[PDB]
Amino acid sequence: MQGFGVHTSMWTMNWDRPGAERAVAAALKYEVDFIEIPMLNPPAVDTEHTRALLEKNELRALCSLGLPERAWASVRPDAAIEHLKVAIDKTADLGGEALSGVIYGGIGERTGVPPTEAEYDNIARVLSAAAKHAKSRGIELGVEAVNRYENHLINTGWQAVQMIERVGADNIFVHLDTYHMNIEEKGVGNGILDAREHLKYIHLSESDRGTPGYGTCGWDEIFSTLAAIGFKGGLAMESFINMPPEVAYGLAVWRPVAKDEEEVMGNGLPFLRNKAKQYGLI
Amino acid sequence: TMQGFGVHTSMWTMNWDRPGAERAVAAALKYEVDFIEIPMLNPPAVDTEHTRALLEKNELRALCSLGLPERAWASVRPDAAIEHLKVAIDKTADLGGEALSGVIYGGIGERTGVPPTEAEYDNIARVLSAAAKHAKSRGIELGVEAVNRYENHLINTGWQAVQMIERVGADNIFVHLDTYHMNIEEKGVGNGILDAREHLKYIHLSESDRGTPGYGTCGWDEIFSTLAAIGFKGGLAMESFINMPPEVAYGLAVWRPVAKDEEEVMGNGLPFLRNKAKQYGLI
Amino acid sequence: MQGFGVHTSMWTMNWDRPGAERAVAAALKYEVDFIEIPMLNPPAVDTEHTRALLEKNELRALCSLGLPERAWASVRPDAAIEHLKVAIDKTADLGGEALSGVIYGGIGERTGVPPTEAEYDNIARVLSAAAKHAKSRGIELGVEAVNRYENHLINTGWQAVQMIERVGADNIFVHLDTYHMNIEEKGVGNGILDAREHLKYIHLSESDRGTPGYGTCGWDEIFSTLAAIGFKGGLAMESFINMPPEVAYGLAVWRPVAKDEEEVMGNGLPFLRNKAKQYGLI
Amino acid sequence: TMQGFGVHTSMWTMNWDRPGAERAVAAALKYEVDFIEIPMLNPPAVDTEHTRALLEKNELRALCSLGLPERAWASVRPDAAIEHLKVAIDKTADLGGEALSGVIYGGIGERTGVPPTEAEYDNIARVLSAAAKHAKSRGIELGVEAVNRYENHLINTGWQAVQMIERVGADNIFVHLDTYHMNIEEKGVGNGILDAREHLKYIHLSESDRGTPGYGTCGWDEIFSTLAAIGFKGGLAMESFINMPPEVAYGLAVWRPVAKDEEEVMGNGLPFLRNKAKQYGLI
Ligand SMILES: O=C(CO)[C@H](O)[C@@H](O)[C@H](O)CO
Ligand SMILES: O=C(CO)[C@H](O)[C@@H](O)[C@H](O)CO
Ligand SMILES: O=C(CO)[C@H](O)[C@@H](O)[C@H](O)CO
Ligand SMILES: O=C(CO)[C@H](O)[C@@H](O)[C@H](O)CO
Ligand SMILES: OC[C@]1(O)OC[C@@H](O)[C@H](O)[C@H]1O
Ligand SMILES: OC[C@]1(O)OC[C@@H](O)[C@H](O)[C@H]1O
Ligand SMILES: OC[C@]1(O)OC[C@@H](O)[C@H](O)[C@H]1O
Ligand SMILES: [Mg+2]
Ligand SMILES: [Mg+2]
Ligand SMILES: [Mg+2]
Ligand SMILES: [Mg+2]
């Protein structure tokens, strides 16, 4: 994945047929290169319809998800493997090139105590099996580090890399998110540095999930460090103008992040494209 | 109105028993602070006279802070919240504290999955009006600390805190901001200070990862410049989660160390904050 | 002045008839509230044409200059007074509301040692005379602090305020410039703080004189501090893009500051207006 | 190959005379820096055996820096520049210095009034080629420091510095950046580091007003993150003009104190920079 993309919560709450149409049409208005589609209810996704829309409008895609509690990999690894296999198949069927996000646990997952080796061992077994299935469908898997309040297992670039190393697959990458790094990284550039050998995808998300350029993220540090490590993967926006219901409780958007998609896309995407030009990103 | 620099004593003591109070006051003297913030996990157990004597002997000012336990969350159990707050207010006053602050309007862990409602805010306002009257009768103030979306769904920004203060209509409730929470919640960190400017009397100076101030993602120059520009008169209180007791830490989503040790946090973070306060004239 | 404006150097440094027309046309294109008119040669300005242009287009204006060497106030105060009187009359007659800039000296002053009381006494005598003339024509005067390399006399907000106190006039204000403050102020907000009782005008200029938003100025600190002191004066964008070479060389522009006007105005003005909205200056 | 932390000796002495050398070396030991950077502005006046003995006695490494005097500006008087640089290189080597850096291609305060020309750059390239051979004969390297538009019109950015190193084609010339200069010249400070990454061996960590690092407008987190990202392994050196060498004062434009004294800059600035280097995993 290359260039600029948008997580489709910018435009649709649910990836149903009307929502897919609405999101793809909106993406065309902004000349982005790809979209990121939530894979939160895999049997409900009409893959033939989404593939038709993507190919007609010359858009690339990937999918992302968080695991439902019934299938959290850390404690119910057999259910997690079965869920990920279905999500991988649907991602591949619609033409998506990867399945990323919190593929190792829940959005809002917490035991109340620090993560344990038994949990990480379960996650490793799940991701090893999922990565084999992904290879059979020709897609990659991404592991997104999220903040301490959304998951207790993988919060930093360094923890994400440790899991990629624990699994020992060749088709799992690290996915970072500036909103999460703004909380978790001891200096935001350190997350990028720690993840550099595996970093293929980054959510350029403002500190309050609003408009990039108008929060507390350290954008100049972020873009300088991406340029320094030779980043050439996907640059994707993530702003919860709409909230997918299956993850709303974990994402904690209790008030509007911005007025509407026109504001976030009209002000945020030019800011990010201009910063990528300024620091010479590949 | 607290003045100068202080510290939240969690780095030495979250259980304010007799040895814990001595340990915390000894730390405050070591680091030469102007005041301490005393956590009240269990208000009834506090020895008010021992603490009062310690503060007076050492010319240390203090305030107290807490969050409501689930049995007393104001949004849903306002009668129980009033009863909890009355005990904490009396203990604060009797030990010589000048205010009770923190998440006095709810608890860590509140989340409905939807936006806060008028019904919830009505209950919070009734609780804070009763608590404010009790605090007035004991000659202290109350502070409302805005915390981030994941800890509570009701008061996350300076502007929401001010709206609640206006809803209650008391004269002795102020806004308490926290740079760690503002780093998530405010649309530009200075905007929390700007929105709260008529009521801001206290700020937690905490790094973005609860570690060492100066070494994270908080915008310290914007924070201190904006405090100076609004003419901030109030407590500058350092807050770090280093050495917090495990069960408290886990409740605040601390799953891994926030910093190497106290010598990193206090040896690097306190001078950073004092230097910034001098730089921008807050001193 | 209130709202947003532009220093017209991007279209005109020589305020002749076609230059005035070109600048007012640009002001309307970018929907600004006011223009800052450079006065390289005050005697040559057609005051009636400019006044009619401003009035017809509902545009407000102020003027600015730096003193030429024959009239540097620190050493040639009588000549400085004569030069300022002519500029003040031209400003008032064209409908301008203030004369600002380096009205206390010139670009290129440098003794090699710290500024002296004798220098400051001559400047104060000049500004006292000029302020009285300005008052008789109904306009104010602004003192722009500029960096150490351009002039050795007034570099910080606090130095500007000390000169306002030394003169004792009631119609002189402080004019700050983010490009100069980025060098001179010990934390950029401190220039605004120190000048808070007298600050009525600010040049919003990137650190390299290029595109605001894309440099090393601390824009969030600048706008938050302006909001916090209750700033109600002019927000004026300044960029050296397309400056006439002669003038550019005198300001040490040895290479392009930006790609073109489309970059500077198309990226820079929205950035600044968005920041002003974000922090409630509007 | 300088490494670790060092200080430009204007922190402590206005001239590198015998009393000034003793003062500066003594102060450097008090702060446990790894090296000092000695101005080479009056080469025939430097007592090289005295400085060598002090450095060797106190286990301190050193390099030298300069700006060319107008009589020997390389862009217009290249033969004089070569003769001046040969003397400066010889004295640097005699006192045990490992490199000669700074504005070795022109003046501090050099200005024609118009943009730089190819003929000026041809002269500089010829000078630097000849100087680089002499430096190799004495076993030291040369550094080219980009400085801002008001101090020199020829080399202002990392990218311009690299273009000159490539033009000269000598393998013993490195790029030397300075955060005070990059704060003005680089379109985003990290771009200077990125542009110079193949040749960057030395950086002045100098605050935006030449005062205390951490208390100005330099983007330190961006600076340190980008240094770490490019694998920087050279010298990290402070530059604060507590004292002003007279031969460059007019060009450096320090008209008012940059800070209270050296105790304030070293006491607050060096720990800040060391802590940032640790934070981003340089040191
Ligand atoms: O940032 C995230 C959740 O905090 C993830 O990026 C998540 O939103 C997935 O995309 C769900 O589609
Ligand atoms: O920031 C806070 C919780 O997130 C509060 O400051 C908390 O630490 C309590 O009041 C502790 O007394
Ligand atoms: O910033 C400035 C010079 O450095 C001034 O603003 C200058 O542009 C003149 O006054 C222009 O009229
Ligand atoms: O930063 C500098 C001058 O602007 C340099 O470090 C200067 O010291 C010369 O290059 C050597 O003095
Ligand atoms: O693919 C075009 C279309 O409009 O997409 C949305 C879907 O609900 C509609 O049934 C279908 O006709
Ligand atoms: O002046 C700013 C401020 O918020 O004004 C109101 C006052 O209660 C506070 O002490 C002070 O910080
Ligand atoms: O090297 C020791 C010493 O003190 O350094 C300073 C120099 O002026 C003195 O002459 C010499 O004795
Ligand atoms: Mg994300
Ligand atoms: Mg707090
Ligand atoms: Mg200006
Ligand atoms: Mg330097």
Cross-strand partners of A248: none
Tell which one of B7, B11, B65, B176 to mutate to probe ligand 2, the residue whose CB is within 8 A of the most ligand atoms. B65
Please give the torsion angle defined by the CA atoms of residues B35, B41, B43 and B46, in that order, rounded to the nearest 10 degrees. -60
Tell which one of B195, B198, B223 to mutate to probe ligand 6, the residue whose CB is within 8 A of the most ligand atoms. B198
> Which method, experimentally, gave rise to this model?
X-ray
Pick the residue of D275, D278, D282 with the most B CBs within 10 A to test the interface with B by mutation. D275
Pick the residue of B208, B215, B260 with the most D CBs within 10 A to test the interface with D by mutation. B215
- The alpha carbon of C235 and the centre of ligand 8 are apart by a number of angstroms equal to 36
Q: Which residue of D has its CA nearest to B272?
A: D272
Pick the residue of B151, B159, B183, B208 with the most A CBs within 10 A to test the interface with A by mutation. B208
Q: How far apart, in whole angstroms, are the C-alpha atoms of residue B196 and residue B157? A: 9
CB contacts, 8 Å: C272 with chain A: none
- Residues of A at the D interface (Cβ-Cβ below 8 Å)? 186-190, 192-193, 196, 218, 220-221, 223-225, 227-229, 278-280
* Chains touching A (3+ CB pairs < 8 Å): B, C, D
Beta pairing, strands D99-103 & D141-145 = parallel
Nearest-atom number in ligand 2 for the CA of B151 is: 4
Q: B229 and C196 in contact by Cβ < 8 A?
A: yes
Q: Which residues line ligand 6 (CB under 6 A)?
A: B 1, 197-198, 200-201, 230-234
- The alpha carbon of D37 and the centre of ligand 4 are apart by a number of angstroms equal to 10
Token pair belonging to C105: 């000296």
CB contacts, 8 Å: A192 with chain D: 225, 229
Q: How far apart, in whole angstroms, are the C-alpha atoms of residue D228 and residue D279? A: 10
Cross-strand partners of C38: C64
Resolution of the experimentally solved model in angstroms: 1.7
- For ligand 4, atom 5, the nearest C-alpha belongs to D102
Burial class of residue B137 (count of CB atoms within 10 Å of its CB; 0-12, 13-18, 19+): exposed
Nearest-atom number in ligand 3 for the CA of C64 is: 12
- Residues of B at the C interface (Cβ-Cβ below 8 Å)? 187-191, 193-194, 197, 219, 221-222, 224-226, 228-230, 279-281
CB contacts, 8 Å: C275 with chain A: 214
CA D166 to chain centre: 20
Q: A190 and D225 in contact by Cβ < 8 A?
A: yes
Integer CA distances (angstroms), A143 to A103, A195, B36, C179, in order: 6, 11, 42, 42
- The alpha carbon of C10 and the centre of ligand 2 are apart by a number of angstroms equal to 52
Place of tokens 């118009």: D114
Ligand nearest to the CA of B177: 9
CB contacts, 8 Å: D256 with chain C: 114, 155
- The alpha carbon of D66 and the centre of ligand 4 are apart by a number of angstroms equal to 7
**What kind and span of H or E run contains B122?**
helix B118-137
Q: Which residue of B has its CA nearest to A217?
A: B217
Q: Which residue of A has its CA nearest to C278?
A: A214
Q: What is the 3-state secondary structure (H, E, C) of chain C?
A: CCEEEEEHHHCCCCCCHHHHHHHHHHHHHCCCCEEEEECCCHHHCCHHHHHHHHHHCCCEEEEEEECCHHHCCCCCHHHHHHHHHHHHHHHHHCCCCEEEEECCCCCCCCCCCCCCHHHHHHHHHHHHHHHHHHHHCCCEEEEECCCCCCCCCCCCHHHHHHHHHHHCCCCEEEEEEHHHHHHHCCCCHHHHHHCCCCEEEEEECCCCCCCCCCCCCCHHHHHHHHHHCCCCCEEEECCCCCCCHHHHHHCCCCCCCCCCHHHHHHHHHHHHHHHHHHCCCC
What φ, ψ does residue C188 adopt, rounded to 5°? -65, -35
Ligand nearest to the CA of B102: 2
Q: How far apart, in whole angstroms, are the C-alpha atoms of residue A106 and residue A73? A: 9
CB contacts, 8 Å: D279 with chain B: 215
User: Any idea what the Cα angle at residue B46 is, between residues B42 and B49, rounded to 5°?
Assistant: 165
Token pair belonging to A209: 């999930």
Count of structural domains, chain B: 1
Query: Which residues lie below 8 Å from residue D180, measured CB to CB, with a gap of 6+?
Result: D148, D204, D206, D207, D208, D210, D218, D239
**What kind and span of H or E run contains B205?**
strand B200-205
Amino acid symbol at C282: I
Do D51 and D21 form a contact (C-beta atoms < 8 A)?
Answer: yes
DSSP assignment of A117-166, as one string?
Answer: HHHHHHHHHHHHHHHHHHHHHT-EEEEE---TTT-SS--SHHHHHHHHHH
Q: Does B90 contact ligand 2 (Cβ within 6 A)?
A: no
Judge whether A238 counts as a catalytic residue.
yes
* Domain ranges, residue B281: 1-283
Q: How near does any CA of chain C get to the CA of B170, in Å? A: 25
DSSP assignment of A90-120, as one string?
Answer: HHHHTT-SEEEEETTS-TT---SS---HHHH
**Catalytic entry in B37, B110, B145, B186:** B145
Query: Which residues lie below 8 Å from residue D49, measured CB to CB, with a gap of 6+?
Result: D94, D95
Longest Cα–Cα distance of chain B, Å, equals 49
**What kind and span of H or E run contains B88?**
helix B78-94
Q: Does A38 contact ligand 1 (Cβ within 6 A)?
A: yes
CB contacts, 8 Å: A223 with chain D: 188, 190
Q: How near does any CA of chain B get to the CA of A4, in Å? A: 24
Q: How near does any CA of chain C get to the CA of D57, in Å? A: 37
Q: How far apart, in whole angstroms, are the C-alpha atoms of residue A47 and residue A45? A: 6
CB contacts, 8 Å: B215 with chain A: 186-187
Q: A220 and D189 in contact by Cβ < 8 A?
A: yes
Give the three-state DSSP class for B7: strand
**Catalytic entry in D145, D151, D186, D262:** D145
Q: How near does any CA of chain A get to the CA of C262, in Å? A: 13
Q: How far apart, in whole angstroms, are the C-alpha atoms of residue D231 and residue B154? A: 46
Do D184 and C181 form a contact (C-beta atoms < 8 A)?
Answer: no
- The alpha carbon of B65 and the centre of ligand 2 are apart by a number of angstroms equal to 7
- The alpha carbon of C177 and the centre of ligand 10 are apart by a number of angstroms equal to 5
**Nearest residue to A123 via CA among A67, A180, A39, A42:** A67
Token pair belonging to B50: 């021992």
Rg of chain D over all Cα atoms, to the nearest angstrom: 17
User: Any idea what the Cα angle at residue B188 is, between residues B203 and A159, rounded to 5°?
Assistant: 85
**Nearest residue to A207 via CA among A179, A236, A165, A167:** A179
- Residues of C at the B interface (Cβ-Cβ below 8 Å)? 186-190, 192-193, 196, 218, 220-221, 223-225, 227-229, 278-280
Tell which one of B145, B218, B258 to mutate to probe ligand 2, the residue whose CB is within 8 A of the most ligand atoms. B145
Cross-strand partners of B39: B65
Please give the torsion angle defined by the CA atoms of residues A119, A123, A124 and A125, in that order, rounded to the nearest 10 degrees. 100
Burial class of residue C242 (count of CB atoms within 10 Å of its CB; 0-12, 13-18, 19+): middle
What φ, ψ does residue D74 adopt, rounded to 5°? -65, -30
Q: How far apart, in whole angstroms, are the C-alpha atoms of residue C54 and residue C52? A: 5
Query: Which residues lie below 8 Å from residue D127, measured CB to CB, with a gap of 6+?
Result: D74, D78, D81, D82, D85, D105
Token pair belonging to D20: 């000034």
Q: Does A82 contact ligand 5 (Cβ within 6 A)?
A: no
- The alpha carbon of C197 and the centre of ligand 6 are apart by a number of angstroms equal to 19
Cross-strand partners of B65: B39, B101
Cross-strand partners of D5: D236
Amino acid symbol at A12: T
Going by the DSSP 8-state scheme, the letter that residue D59 receives in this structure is T
> Residue B280: which of C187, C218, C223 has the nearest Cβ?
C187
Please give the torsion angle defined by the CA atoms of residues C146, C147, C148 and C152, in that order, rounded to the nearest 10 degrees. 0
